[PDB]
Amino acid sequence: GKLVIWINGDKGYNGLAEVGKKFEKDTGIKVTVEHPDKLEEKFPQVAATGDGPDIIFWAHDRFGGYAQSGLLAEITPDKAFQDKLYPFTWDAVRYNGKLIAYPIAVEALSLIYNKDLLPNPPKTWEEIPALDKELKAKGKSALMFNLQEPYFTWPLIAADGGYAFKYENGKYDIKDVGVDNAGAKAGLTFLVDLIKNKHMNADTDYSIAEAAFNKGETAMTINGPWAWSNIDTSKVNYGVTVLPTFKGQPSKPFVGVLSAGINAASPNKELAKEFLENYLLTDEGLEAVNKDKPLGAVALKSYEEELAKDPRIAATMENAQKGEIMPNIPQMSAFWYAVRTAVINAASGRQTVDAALAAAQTNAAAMSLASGKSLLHEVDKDISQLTQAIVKNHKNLLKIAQYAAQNRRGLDLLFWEQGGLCKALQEQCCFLNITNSHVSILQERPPLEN
Amino acid sequence: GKLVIWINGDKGYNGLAEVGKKFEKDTGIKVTVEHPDKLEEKFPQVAATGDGPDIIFWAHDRFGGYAQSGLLAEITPDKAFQDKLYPFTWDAVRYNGKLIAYPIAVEALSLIYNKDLLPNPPKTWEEIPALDKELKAKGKSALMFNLQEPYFTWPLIAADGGYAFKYENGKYDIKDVGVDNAGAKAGLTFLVDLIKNKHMNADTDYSIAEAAFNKGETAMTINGPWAWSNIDTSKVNYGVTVLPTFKGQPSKPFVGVLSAGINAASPNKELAKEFLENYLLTDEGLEAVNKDKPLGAVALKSYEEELAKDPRIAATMENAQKGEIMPNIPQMSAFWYAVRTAVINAASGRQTVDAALAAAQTNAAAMSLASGKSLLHEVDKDISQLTQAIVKNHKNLLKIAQYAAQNRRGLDLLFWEQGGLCKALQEQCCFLNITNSHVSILQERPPLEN
Amino acid sequence: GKLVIWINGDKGYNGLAEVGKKFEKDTGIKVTVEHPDKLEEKFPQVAATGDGPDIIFWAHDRFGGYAQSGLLAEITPDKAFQDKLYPFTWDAVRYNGKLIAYPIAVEALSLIYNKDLLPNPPKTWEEIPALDKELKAKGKSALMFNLQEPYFTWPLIAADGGYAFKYENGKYDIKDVGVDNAGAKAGLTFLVDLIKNKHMNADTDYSIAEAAFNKGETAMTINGPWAWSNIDTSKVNYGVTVLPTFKGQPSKPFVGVLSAGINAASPNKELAKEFLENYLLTDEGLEAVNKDKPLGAVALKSYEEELAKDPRIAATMENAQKGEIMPNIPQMSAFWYAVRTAVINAASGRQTVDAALAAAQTNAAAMSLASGKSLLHEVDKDISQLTQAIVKNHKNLLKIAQYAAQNRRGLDLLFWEQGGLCKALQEQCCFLNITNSHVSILQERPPLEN
Ligand SMILES: OC[C@H]1O[C@H](O[C@H]2[C@H](O)[C@@H](O)[C@@H](O)O[C@@H]2CO)[C@H](O)[C@@H](O)[C@@H]1O
Ligand SMILES: OC[C@H]1O[C@H](O[C@H]2[C@H](O)[C@@H](O)[C@@H](O)O[C@@H]2CO)[C@H](O)[C@@H](O)[C@@H]1O
Ligand SMILES: OC[C@H]1O[C@H](O[C@H]2[C@H](O)[C@@H](O)[C@@H](O)O[C@@H]2CO)[C@H](O)[C@@H](O)[C@@H]1O
Ligand SMILES: [Cl-]
Ligand SMILES: [Cl-]
């Protein structure tokens, strides 16, 4: 009989906490916003047991999976309301020919540079290397951004050719991935060469890249609206514009439409519908959240009209224009996971651009029972070994125990006219009651081939 | 040169032990019947190594898999003998266009109620809730049955729509499952609501549900022929009739034809053929087993004629009539496993009806090497941790040992004119020979990514 | 700026070490040959990280996989050079319609017998049993060979029908395997019957079978050119001829074209091209390696002309003629692995010919997330158990520690006018600083279902 919302801790939550009050005293219903880590992973797990938030906030790309796993309820926006929001963002939230989430805003990474250290930014990726040179001599760097999430480097990977799944005739092809073609390699190798050439680090993430640009330690960065807020507060004269090109090709970023979905396990299913339909998705609702952390190109037509006239937003849309709309299909988590590994491995040097990118593709396929078996049998040789080790420790323990007991025996004899050892020290007596049941249980332990 | 049969401990084994004697002294060949737990799982494992019984008894549904795994021999019933048994039960035991087992009897769950506590039983599922109310007030309950095996609750899941695989044009479609559609959810949610509303328990199984109906603690129950025996012995006036309806739809139970198969690793392959063809599948053979535990609608035409005129049997057939014939395809074990998990999870509340039922479906598909890899790598982070723990224990052990040795040192000095410690206590000396080889082996331990 | 080659330790490496010198002083570039165990497995792993050899030597069958994993560079043999080598061996090294390795020689197992113990060899498999009888009476055996690698017994498995993948219309069909058909079983059962009948052992490998034939302990053996060298040195009058027939059918051996590939991670990519194109693949290059360990039917036309006139080579080609060319497709490692398991299991009796051969086939398919899950959950019940065991050991350790400390306490009291225990023994004091951090870490340990 309440209402709980979940949003990314990197978005305008306190701003949503406000619209969360408008609902409370104007409806009485207590709204509560939460922002946990690994949100996209947590929800599906807690939601699966009937727990979790009534409303979930995340990009549309991973909703199809939550829907496939049957975790949310189909929303029912009255044919009228559907015309308050842009049609293209409605599709982004329509899975299996049905609506599964309320689009909130359109996001697209952009190129943020500090006009005070770089009045004129680079129009090409190819020149950042030599540009970083000049700045490194001055103490700072040229470009810094999160290298932990494929989301950021992907725009470069797609630039010269890379692509998730081919959208063949209004239908994405799962057997048609393109994470390991020419364009792909090209992009990744360049990015890596950047780290290889000390222009970039790899242990670098979000808080690391964010704190650096904001401290003026770097001239460039790649992010989305939500960031702008913290830069303003940092009094650094920044500028938002189109992303650099690669091999003459514009960086193709993956665009996502942040959405609000309704936990199928939710009892307050209408409370939500009305909170989003009549409280959030309003010009004054989108605004409160925006004052907290820029949403970008909101879906509400009325609000986008006086938001689109802003350069930071115009550039975000040009970027999304240059990019592609993320797919819905449940095969995203995999895809994304595949690319996270490639990028991290290739960058960390644990893999090669050619090797990493290949794995990504080939691995998107089914593993034989054989491997599962081999895997199985393998872990056995393993577990078994831990056992004997454990088992052995027990015995030795015992050998030590008896040894101790014996010594203690001689003591009691020395302190006999005292009452043995414990009585002569006038202290609580100790006791070697030693027993390890699991020791045996682990020996019986049937084979894992069952 | 002998002969061994395996049957479920819940069926008429001692009755088969008798026909097992008719074979012995009338052929000399010693027959032996066994009934182990997890029979359907055990056989494939022991049979795989050439061990196990010459003859196996279980429902036809899982024989295709034993045949696929190449565990049984094709039977050779002479075109004449095939007309002693009902044609429809012959199909149930024909895989890949070949015969793999001898059908014994047709089984179909029914509704058993105690006429003395409920003269008139419920014709609908929807009324058991309120009916359980009246009885709970009297001390007993309304319905109780095994909730550990999908077999029992399935009739409800299929009732309003659920289905294993769609039989498209004389061919079952593996890509066409129906464990997560409307009818499915409907049924499961109701069943769960029954437990949710304290009308039913979930930790409840066979022996629990069987002992309750037989003790008169409950008015209803769902089972098959084999059960009737123990009720008779319990002097409870029971009645067997059609299963209740759900949403106006009759509970569709999965019918199985208990069969006898021949271990391909069997040397006494003809001994079997003749034991089943000329000793078991005879009116007097089926009868002996029947006196032990009701087989149901046997396959032997002659015996079914004077068995079908029995209400308990008429109702069993009406039930099977209302239901569907179980598929042969090796993809049953999976399917069944999928539903066992759904039902147990949904009931125990560990999952939701919508979440559980979905898993069942989506999981019937292939997992990426990625997951296998992720899984792999994951278990590593794990195993490794156990190591260091183990490893650490060893060291501490040693620290303790030396500590002990030292103390012992001072003792020998106190009891020096005695011969040290051991000599003064005049007892076998203890010894700290401490060594854990596996400790190192576990350190070397290559990564699991190989 | 160097150059490293990897070849099997069972081939002519020192011979290649020589041609490795011709390159050095005639180019200055230092060449180094290595021969590690599990080469085919090692390379893909080290090559994946950018390490490993610039050139890899192994049969063509597993190159497609290295290419699929993107581990080698496409070679560029000038249209002219391609006519120095036999066209059929060029195909063997062409994957995805591109060249990935330089063919070196064509290999095909043969039948080696000691003319001095068996002037006339068996033309059929069926007679070795009774022939082994006569010889066993004389102290020796009839046939001995490596039973650890499917490569050797495969010629028998394919003889009467077995086959990897069906080559349908210039295209191998992955869904069309034939490791579990009639011919297959036939062959395997016979082979096994050979061991079952004490004519053959199963713990038998290469060094075991090689040392026996060379010591004159056996009259026959199955191997390839590389072997001949060691027999010559052993002064045993051997003979190389066609393989025995099975059920009237000639043993169909799998032929491989030993090839040299170029690590895609290689900086000396041209150094290689020139080492193989102008130094190795020359009549004098092939020769140096040949003096070390027979290559067989080399690919260099000029050298094959005066090599083919040799009986050992004529017979090798007749054998390959009777056999089939190994496929390129990455699905070989699996296939091979599948057959290694079948043969070892069937032979060791851990499985039956019918059961083992089936697994091989059915397992070449995808495993459900279910199994992965079941597997997962299963390992949990496992890991968890090891924990509590470990955990328990810790506690007991502690109980022992305190016990020890206490005893020590009484000692210090006995040796008080000495300075306690440590001071009376005038030795470094011991210390029970006991702490197992992982103990807790392992308790927190989230479930593996994440
Ligand atoms: O990097 C993989 C990740 O990419 C996208 O997530 C973005 C999200 O859309 C943005 O709104 C912002 O919060 O940052 C995320 C990356 O940190 C996908 O939407 C997401 O599913 C995927 O895992
Ligand atoms: O619950 C899954 C289970 O269902 C069927 O097994 C029945 C069997 O047919 C009956 O004869 C009786 O013994 O009880 C079983 C359930 O306990 C399937 O035949 C079986 O394969 C499946 O696992
Ligand atoms: O037994 C499986 C194994 O077979 C073939 O390997 C042969 C190789 O071709 C020969 O040149 C020689 O070295 O011995 C090997 C078997 O020990 C396949 O080429 C190989 O991939 C496969 O694993
Ligand atoms: Cl002690
Ligand atoms: Cl331990």
Side-chain angles (χ1 to χ4, degrees):
Chain A
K2 213 239 233 145
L3 204 79
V4 177
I5 279 132
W6 274 20
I7 185 129
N8 215 204
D10 82 349
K11 261 106 214 273
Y13 53 81
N14 283 148
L16 172 90
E18 271 167 37
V19 46
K21 261 62 140 234
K22 206 185 140 198
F23 190 77
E24 241 240 297
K25 305 315 172 190
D26 196 16
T27 250
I29 287 154
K30 157 145 116 174
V31 130
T32 344
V33 196
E34 271 185 28
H35 55 96
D37 320 297
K38 307 187 231 166
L39 169 47
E40 76 269 29
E41 277 167 4
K42 238 142 201 312
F43 166 84
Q45 313 196 326
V46 275
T49 49
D51 300 53
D54 302 65
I55 304 149
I56 189 57
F57 279 89
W58 195 271
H60 70 121
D61 65 313
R62 83 176 25 251
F63 275 77
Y66 293 139
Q68 192 209 228
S69 317
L71 291 172
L72 9 127
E74 149 154 34
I75 63 169
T76 31
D78 342 314
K79 277 299 175 168
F81 180 99
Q82 311 219 116
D83 297 70
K84 274 195 227 179
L85 267 69
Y86 289 110
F88 89 96
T89 62
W90 269 128
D91 310 337
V93 291
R94 171 211 322 288
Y95 163 79
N96 258 1
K98 310 228 152 157
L99 294 169
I100 69 184
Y102 272 122
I104 316 295
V106 184
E107 331 168 332
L109 283 166
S110 263
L111 174 55
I112 301 149
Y113 64 98
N114 157 0
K115 319 221 233 90
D116 255 355
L117 276 171
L118 187 75
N120 180 113
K123 261 98 249 162
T124 73
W125 266 105
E126 305 89 335
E127 43 174 290
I128 288 73
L131 147 74
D132 167 74
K133 243 241 233 191
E134 341 176 20
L135 299 156
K136 218 67 150 255
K138 276 120 113 287
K140 351 228 120 176
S141 12
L143 169 67
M144 220 155 142
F145 67 96
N146 176 26
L147 291 177
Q148 299 341 272
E149 297 293 327
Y151 188 46
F152 303 76
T153 107
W154 176 255
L156 177 53
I157 301 172
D160 198 62
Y163 68 90
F165 313 98
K166 189 114 113 272
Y167 200 49
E168 333 169 336
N169 285 279
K171 188 165 188 184
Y172 280 110
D173 195 316
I174 55 101
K175 273 188 183 175
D176 198 327
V177 195
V179 174
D180 185 60
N181 54 31
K185 283 128 121 157
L188 193 48
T189 74
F190 181 90
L191 146 67
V192 177
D193 273 346
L194 234 27
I195 320 179
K196 176 183 144 231
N197 291 145
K198 262 62 46 66
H199 292 153
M200 217 143 56
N201 264 57
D203 141 293
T204 276
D205 63 38
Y206 198 100
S207 152
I208 303 301
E210 176 188 44
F213 187 94
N214 289 182
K215 249 131 143 189
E217 265 131 338
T218 290
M220 269 157 327
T221 194
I222 300 180
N223 234 127
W226 53 96
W228 308 344
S229 268
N230 288 180
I231 315 170
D232 298 332
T233 317
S234 90
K235 86 198 155 161
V236 155
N237 238 47
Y238 67 100
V240 182
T241 187
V242 184
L243 272 160
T245 52
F246 184 58
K247 303 228 264 112
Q249 305 326 117
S251 305
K252 316 226 152 20
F254 243 153
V255 55
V257 193
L258 158 92
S259 309
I262 296 101
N263 185 332
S266 190
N268 339 346
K269 288 214 187 44
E270 249 268 326
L271 280 73
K273 156 157 223 214
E274 291 171 339
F275 170 80
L276 302 153
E277 267 202 334
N278 296 148
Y279 273 58
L280 184 82
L281 263 62
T282 62
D283 280 310
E284 211 153 27
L286 295 181
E287 244 160 79
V289 187
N290 209 120
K291 314 304 160 67
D292 193 18
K293 247 68 147 289
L295 288 161
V298 290
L300 204 66
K301 320 236 206 110
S302 29
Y303 200 34
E304 242 310 83
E305 255 112 35
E306 62 196 13
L307 251 187
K309 294 328 133 190
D310 175 304
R312 333 231 279 315
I313 295 303
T316 288
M317 281 306 285
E318 280 152 29
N319 265 140
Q321 200 47 231
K322 241 75 123 260
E324 224 201 41
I325 196 63
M326 287 196 246
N328 240 5
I329 70 186
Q331 297 86 197
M332 269 320 258
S333 35
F335 162 73
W336 275 127
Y337 166 92
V339 191
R340 211 223 166 159
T341 302
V343 168
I344 293 192
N345 278 346
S348 79
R350 288 321 145 191
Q351 258 191 320
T352 88
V353 176
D354 268 15
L357 273 190
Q361 162 155 7
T362 302
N363 282 275
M367 80 175 277
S368 306
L369 273 169
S371 322
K373 269 273 220 193
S374 158
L375 196 176
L376 221 50
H377 165 96
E378 273 314 327
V379 194
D380 259 303
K381 192 163 140 149
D382 273 274
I383 312 177
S384 155
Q385 248 290 11
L386 294 145
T387 315
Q388 355 203 6
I390 296 155
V391 178
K392 180 78 204 196
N393 266 346
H394 183 32
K395 333 214 283 95
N396 284 334
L397 256 180
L398 305 182
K399 186 138 233 226
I400 305 197
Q402 336 239 30
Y403 190 97
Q406 175 153 75
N407 281 325
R408 166 94 130 232
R409 245 163 260 144
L411 268 165
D412 284 333
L413 168 37
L414 289 164
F415 280 118
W416 80 276
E417 12 205 20
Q418 255 97 356
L421 181 79
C422 292
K423 245 205 256 179
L425 286 178
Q426 290 291 322
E427 59 179 80
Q428 193 67 5
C429 216
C430 278
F431 269 125
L432 295 148
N433 152 14
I434 280 93
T435 284
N436 211 316
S437 37
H438 323 269
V439 152
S440 305
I441 326 186
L442 282 164
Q443 328 231 359
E444 317 286 28
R445 198 232 138 182
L448 204 71
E449 184 193 348
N450 301 326
Chain B
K2 213 239 233 145
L3 204 79
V4 177
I5 279 132
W6 274 20
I7 185 129
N8 215 204
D10 82 349
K11 261 106 214 273
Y13 53 81
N14 283 148
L16 172 90
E18 271 167 37
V19 46
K21 261 62 140 234
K22 206 185 140 198
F23 190 77
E24 241 240 297
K25 305 315 172 190
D26 196 16
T27 250
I29 287 154
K30 157 145 116 174
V31 130
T32 344
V33 196
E34 271 185 28
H35 55 96
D37 320 297
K38 307 187 231 166
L39 169 47
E40 76 269 29
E41 277 167 4
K42 238 142 201 312
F43 166 84
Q45 313 196 326
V46 275
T49 49
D51 300 53
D54 302 65
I55 304 149
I56 189 57
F57 279 89
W58 195 271
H60 70 121
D61 65 313
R62 83 176 25 251
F63 275 77
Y66 293 139
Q68 192 209 228
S69 317
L71 291 172
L72 9 127
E74 149 154 34
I75 63 169
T76 31
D78 342 314
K79 277 299 175 168
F81 180 99
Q82 311 219 116
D83 297 70
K84 274 195 227 179
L85 267 69
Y86 289 110
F88 89 96
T89 62
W90 269 128
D91 310 337
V93 291
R94 171 211 322 288
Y95 163 79
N96 258 1
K98 310 228 152 157
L99 294 169
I100 69 184
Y102 272 122
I104 316 295
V106 184
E107 331 168 332
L109 283 166
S110 263
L111 174 55
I112 301 149
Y113 64 98
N114 157 0
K115 319 221 233 90
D116 255 355
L117 276 171
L118 187 75
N120 180 113
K123 261 98 249 162
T124 73
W125 266 105
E126 305 89 335
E127 43 174 290
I128 288 73
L131 147 74
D132 167 74
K133 243 241 233 191
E134 341 176 20
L135 299 156
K136 218 67 150 255
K138 276 120 113 287
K140 351 228 120 176
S141 12
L143 169 67
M144 220 155 142
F145 67 96
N146 176 26
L147 291 177
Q148 299 341 272
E149 297 293 327
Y151 188 46
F152 303 76
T153 107
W154 176 255
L156 177 53
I157 301 172
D160 198 62
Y163 68 90
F165 313 98
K166 189 114 113 272
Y167 200 49
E168 333 169 336
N169 285 279
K171 188 165 188 184
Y172 280 110
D173 195 316
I174 55 101
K175 273 188 183 175
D176 198 327
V177 195
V179 174
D180 185 60
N181 54 31
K185 283 128 121 157
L188 193 48
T189 74
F190 181 90
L191 146 67
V192 177
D193 273 346
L194 234 27
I195 320 179
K196 176 183 144 231
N197 291 145
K198 262 62 46 66
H199 292 153
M200 217 143 56
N201 264 57
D203 141 293
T204 276
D205 63 38
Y206 198 100
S207 152
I208 303 301
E210 176 188 44
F213 187 94
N214 289 182
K215 249 131 143 189
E217 265 131 338
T218 290
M220 269 157 327
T221 194
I222 300 180
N223 234 127
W226 53 96
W228 308 344
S229 268
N230 288 180
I231 315 170
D232 298 332
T233 317
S234 90
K235 86 198 155 161
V236 155
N237 238 47
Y238 67 100
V240 182
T241 187
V242 184
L243 272 160
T245 52
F246 184 58
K247 303 228 264 112
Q249 305 326 117
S251 305
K252 316 226 152 20
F254 243 153
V255 55
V257 193
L258 158 92
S259 309
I262 296 101
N263 185 332
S266 190
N268 339 346
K269 288 214 187 44
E270 249 268 326
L271 280 73
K273 156 157 223 214
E274 291 171 339
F275 170 80
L276 302 153
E277 267 202 334
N278 296 148
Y279 273 58
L280 184 82
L281 263 62
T282 62
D283 280 310
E284 211 153 27
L286 295 181
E287 244 160 79
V289 187
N290 209 120
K291 314 304 160 67
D292 193 18
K293 247 68 147 289
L295 288 161
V298 290
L300 204 66
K301 320 236 206 110
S302 29
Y303 200 34
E304 242 310 83
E305 255 112 35
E306 62 196 13
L307 251 187
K309 294 328 133 190
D310 175 304
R312 333 231 279 315
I313 295 303
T316 288
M317 281 306 285
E318 280 152 29
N319 265 140
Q321 200 47 231
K322 241 75 123 260
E324 224 201 41
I325 196 63
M326 287 196 246
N328 240 5
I329 70 186
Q331 297 86 197
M332 269 320 258
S333 35
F335 162 73
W336 275 127
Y337 166 92
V339 191
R340 211 223 166 159
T341 302
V343 168
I344 293 192
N345 278 346
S348 79
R350 288 321 145 191
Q351 258 191 320
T352 88
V353 176
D354 268 15
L357 273 190
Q361 162 155 7
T362 302
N363 282 275
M367 80 175 277
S368 306
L369 273 169
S371 322
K373 269 273 220 193
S374 158
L375 196 176
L376 221 50
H377 165 96
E378 273 314 327
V379 194
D380 259 304
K381 192 163 140 149
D382 273 274
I383 312 177
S384 155
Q385 248 290 11
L386 294 145
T387 315
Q388 355 203 6
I390 296 155
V391 178
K392 180 78 204 196
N393 266 346
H394 183 32
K395 333 214 283 95
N396 284 334
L397 256 180
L398 305 182
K399 186 138 233 226
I400 305 197
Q402 336 239 30
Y403 190 97
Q406 175 153 75
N407 281 325
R408 166 94 130 232
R409 245 163 260 144
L411 268 165
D412 284 333
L413 168 37
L414 289 164
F415 280 118
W416 80 276
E417 12 205 20
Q418 255 97 356
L421 181 79
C422 292
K423 245 205 256 179
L425 286 178
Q426 290 291 322
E427 59 179 80
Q428 193 67 5
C429 216
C430 278
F431 269 125
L432 295 148
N433 152 14
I434 280 93
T435 284
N436 211 316
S437 37
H438 323 269
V439 152
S440 305
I441 326 186
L442 282 164
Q443 328 231 359
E444 317 286 28
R445 198 232 138 182
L448 204 71
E449 184 193 348
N450 301 326
Chain C
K2 213 239 233 145
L3 204 79
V4 177
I5 279 132
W6 274 20
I7 185 129
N8 215 204
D10 82 349
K11 261 106 214 273
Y13 53 81
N14 283 148
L16 172 90
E18 271 167 37
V19 46
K21 261 62 140 234
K22 206 185 140 198
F23 190 77
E24 241 240 297
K25 305 315 172 190
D26 196 16
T27 250
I29 287 154
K30 157 145 116 174
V31 130
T32 344
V33 196
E34 271 185 28
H35 55 96
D37 320 297
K38 307 187 231 166
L39 169 47
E40 76 269 29
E41 277 167 4
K42 238 142 201 312
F43 166 84
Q45 313 196 326
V46 275
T49 49
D51 300 53
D54 302 65
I55 304 149
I56 189 57
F57 279 89
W58 195 271
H60 70 121
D61 65 313
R62 83 176 25 251
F63 275 77
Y66 293 139
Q68 192 209 228
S69 317
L71 291 172
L72 9 127
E74 149 154 34
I75 63 169
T76 31
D78 342 314
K79 277 299 175 168
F81 180 99
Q82 311 219 116
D83 297 70
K84 274 195 227 179
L85 267 69
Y86 289 110
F88 89 96
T89 62
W90 269 128
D91 310 337
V93 291
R94 171 211 322 288
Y95 163 79
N96 258 1
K98 310 228 152 157
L99 294 169
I100 69 184
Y102 272 122
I104 316 295
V106 184
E107 331 168 332
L109 283 166
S110 263
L111 174 55
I112 301 149
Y113 64 98
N114 157 0
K115 319 221 233 90
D116 255 355
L117 276 171
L118 187 75
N120 180 113
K123 261 98 249 162
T124 73
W125 266 105
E126 305 89 335
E127 43 174 290
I128 288 73
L131 147 74
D132 167 74
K133 243 241 233 191
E134 341 176 20
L135 299 156
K136 218 67 150 255
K138 276 120 113 287
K140 351 228 120 176
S141 12
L143 169 67
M144 220 155 142
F145 67 96
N146 176 26
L147 291 177
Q148 299 341 272
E149 297 293 327
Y151 188 46
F152 303 76
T153 107
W154 176 255
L156 177 53
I157 301 172
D160 198 62
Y163 68 90
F165 313 98
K166 189 114 113 272
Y167 200 49
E168 333 169 336
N169 285 279
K171 188 165 188 184
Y172 280 110
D173 195 316
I174 55 101
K175 273 188 183 175
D176 198 327
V177 195
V179 174
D180 185 60
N181 54 31
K185 283 128 121 157
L188 193 48
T189 74
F190 181 90
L191 146 67
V192 177
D193 273 346
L194 234 27
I195 320 179
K196 176 183 144 231
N197 291 145
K198 262 62 46 66
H199 292 153
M200 217 143 56
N201 264 57
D203 141 293
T204 276
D205 63 38
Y206 198 100
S207 152
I208 303 301
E210 176 188 44
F213 187 94
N214 289 182
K215 249 131 143 189
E217 265 131 338
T218 290
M220 269 157 327
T221 194
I222 300 180
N223 234 127
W226 53 96
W228 308 344
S229 268
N230 288 180
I231 315 170
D232 298 332
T233 317
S234 90
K235 86 198 155 161
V236 155
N237 238 47
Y238 67 100
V240 182
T241 187
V242 184
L243 272 160
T245 52
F246 184 58
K247 303 228 264 112
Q249 305 326 117
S251 305
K252 316 226 152 20
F254 243 153
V255 55
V257 193
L258 158 92
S259 309
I262 296 101
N263 185 332
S266 190
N268 339 346
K269 288 214 187 44
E270 249 268 326
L271 280 73
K273 156 157 223 214
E274 291 171 339
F275 170 80
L276 302 153
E277 267 202 334
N278 296 148
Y279 273 58
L280 184 82
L281 263 62
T282 62
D283 280 310
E284 211 153 27
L286 295 181
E287 244 160 79
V289 187
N290 209 120
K291 314 304 160 67
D292 193 18
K293 247 68 147 289
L295 288 161
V298 290
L300 204 66
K301 320 236 206 110
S302 29
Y303 200 34
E304 242 310 83
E305 255 112 35
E306 62 196 13
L307 251 187
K309 294 328 133 190
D310 175 304
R312 333 231 279 315
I313 295 303
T316 288
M317 281 306 285
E318 280 152 29
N319 265 140
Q321 200 47 231
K322 241 75 123 260
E324 224 201 41
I325 196 63
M326 287 196 246
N328 240 5
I329 70 186
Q331 297 86 197
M332 269 320 258
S333 35
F335 162 73
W336 275 127
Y337 166 92
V339 191
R340 211 223 166 159
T341 302
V343 168
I344 293 192
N345 278 346
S348 79
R350 288 321 145 191
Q351 258 191 320
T352 88
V353 176
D354 268 15
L357 273 190
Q361 162 155 7
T362 302
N363 282 275
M367 80 175 277
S368 306
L369 273 169
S371 322
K373 269 273 220 193
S374 158
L375 196 176
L376 221 50
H377 165 96
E378 273 314 327
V379 194
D380 259 303
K381 192 163 140 149
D382 273 274
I383 312 177
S384 155
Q385 248 290 11
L386 294 145
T387 315
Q388 355 203 6
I390 296 155
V391 178
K392 180 78 204 196
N393 266 346
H394 183 32
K395 333 214 283 95
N396 284 334
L397 256 180
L398 305 182
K399 186 138 233 226
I400 305 197
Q402 336 239 30
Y403 190 97
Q406 175 153 75
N407 281 325
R408 166 94 130 232
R409 245 163 260 144
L411 268 165
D412 284 333
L413 168 37
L414 289 164
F415 280 118
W416 80 276
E417 12 205 20
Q418 255 97 356
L421 181 79
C422 292
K423 245 205 256 179
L425 286 178
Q426 290 291 322
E427 59 179 80
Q428 193 67 5
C429 216
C430 278
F431 269 125
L432 295 148
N433 152 14
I434 280 93
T435 284
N436 211 316
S437 37
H438 323 269
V439 152
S440 305
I441 326 186
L442 282 164
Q443 328 231 359
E444 317 286 28
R445 198 232 138 182
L448 204 71
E449 184 193 348
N450 301 326

